[PDB]
Design a protein around this ligand. Structure first.
Ligand SMILES: [Ca+2]
Ligand SMILES: [Ca+2]
Length: 460
RNA sequence: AAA
């Protein structure tokens, strides 16, 4: 069992516990292909090795070898024929591939190549190479393979920065990881911008990286500094580096600023390049949603004639794009939520219900998203289905997810309003009395709360 | 990637 034990010591995709879910594999493959074609970075070894690992997981071992060979061919050019330690990721993935294919003599050849380099560099381990380049490669792999991996990704880049605080590559990976982790918490009470300083430093150290600049812009916009952010949007848009990705985030920036037409123009250009992007399809849908709201506001909710034809175009176009996003990535929870909400605007309550029911069964990486799912389903039950019983159930389920947030507070307020309404129609509704006590208790008004709980008890 |  010497071979297998040696393979487990290698640092490469096979030993990084990426845990790629089958339902996310088609989207991952498309994102990997998009990145190969459109992300401008110095070394593309990592991304080709991830494509090989994906092909392996698909049962296409011969196709996987092709991607590992391409990774070696490209390394020759990106380092000018010179030796580079990132090759050890490729060689580790060859050893695993050949082991899985039964080409065991070749698997041993690649273990020997790795060992030879670990010796040459005075690495303490025989097969496990300890160098910052490989910590970064582990981090980028994790960062590409979904939100559940982002704490691990950040820690890979942080390990490099603890020894070399001005390392450009790990500064970039740390900042992007941190930005996405901040995104997960953006609606939680008293959230803080942990990623802002990392992004400033990553831009300083990677001055040609437009991708990092547009994330810095968006975090500045989050923090109420939109004009400073817009300067970075403009600098990124003047750069060709990773242009199509720059367009995605500039489009988000302009939509949030209120320039929805500008956002749509950028997204339509980006969709020409990466038409399978679920991020693009969701962003385009949000733009049509924003335009729908603008039409509603100008016509006081009663568009007619051409304005009605325009509203319906916005609704149907948003449904098309949200449906496109969730076809491609069925685990994209918030896109299903936007879709359910847009089916309410289209007057299709059965399709809204269907998507809410799907959402109730999901297990988001971001557990607080289920507050939003219950809250919006509760509102649908209250206002479209005229079911106070089911509205109460789902406002309570939102509240029971204790994390303080904008939506938990809205759920408390919505439950309060519903119960106050019921009590006007029937002041001796014991259930409503107790719920109103519960609401006051959650608000901290302990005397009002016990008053209502007591009143409810007396009746019974 | 909603918020
Ligand atoms: Ca390019
Ligand atoms: Ca190729």
């Amino acid at each position: 069992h010497q071979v297998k034990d040696s393979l487990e010591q290698l640092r490469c995709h096979f030993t990084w516990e990426l845990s790629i879910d089958d339902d996310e594999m088609p989207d991952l493959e498309n994102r990997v292909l998009d990145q190969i074609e459109f992300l401008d970075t110095k070394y593309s070894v990592g991304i080709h090795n991830l494509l090989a690992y994906v092909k392996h997981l698909k049962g296409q071992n011969e196709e996987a070898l092709k991607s590992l060979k391409e990774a070696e061919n490209l390394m020759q050019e990106e380092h000018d024929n010179q030796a580079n330690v990132r090759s050890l990721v490729t060689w580790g993935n060859f050893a695993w591939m050949y082991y899985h294919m039964g080409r065991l003599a070749e698997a041993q050849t690649y273990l020997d190549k790795v060992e030879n380099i670990c010796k040459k560099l005075s690495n303490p381990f025989r097969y496990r190479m300890e160098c910052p380049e490989i910590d970064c490669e582990e981090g980028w792999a994790l960062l590409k393979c979904g939100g559940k991996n982002y704490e691990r990704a950040k820690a890979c880049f942080e390990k490099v920065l603890e020894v070399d605080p001005e390392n450009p590559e790990s500064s970039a990976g740390y900042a992007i990881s941190a930005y996405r982790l901040d995104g997960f918490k953006l609606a939680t009470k008293n959230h803080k911008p942990f990623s802002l300083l990392p992004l400033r430093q990553a831009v300083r150290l990677n001055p040609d990286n437009g991708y990092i600049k547009v994330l810095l812009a968006l975090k500045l916009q989050d923090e109420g500094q939109e004009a400073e952010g817009e300067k970075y949007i403009e600098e990124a848009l003047a750069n060709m580096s990773s242009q199509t990705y720059v367009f995605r985030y500039a489009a988000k920036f302009y939509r949030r600023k209120g320039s929805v037409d500008k956002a749509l123009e950028l997204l339509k250009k980006a969709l020409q390049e990466t038409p399978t992007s679920v991020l693009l399809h969701h962003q385009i849908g949000l733009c049509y949603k924003a335009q729908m709201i603008q039409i509603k506001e100008a016509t006081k909710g009663q568009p007619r004639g051409q304005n009605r034809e325009k509203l319906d175009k916005m609704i149907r176009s948003a449904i098309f794009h949200f449906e496109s996003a969730v076809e491609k990535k069925p685990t994209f929870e918030v896109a299903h939520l936007d879709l359910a909400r847009m089916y309410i605007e289209a007057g299709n309550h059965r399709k809204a219900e269907e998507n809410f029911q799907k959402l109730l069964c999901m297990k988001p990486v971001v557990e607080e998203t289920m507050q939003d799912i219950h809250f919006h389903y509760g509102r649908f039950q209250e206002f479209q289905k005229k079911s106070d019983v089911n509205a109460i159930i789902h406002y309570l389920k939102a509240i029971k997810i204790e994390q303080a947030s904008l939506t938990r507070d809205k759920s408390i307020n919505s439950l309060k309003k519903l119960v106050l309404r019921k009590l006007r129609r029937k002041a001796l509704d014991l259930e409503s009395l107790s719920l109103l006590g519960f609401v006051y208790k959650l608000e901290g008004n302990m005397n009002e709360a016990e008053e209502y709980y007591e009143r409810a008890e007396r009746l019974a």
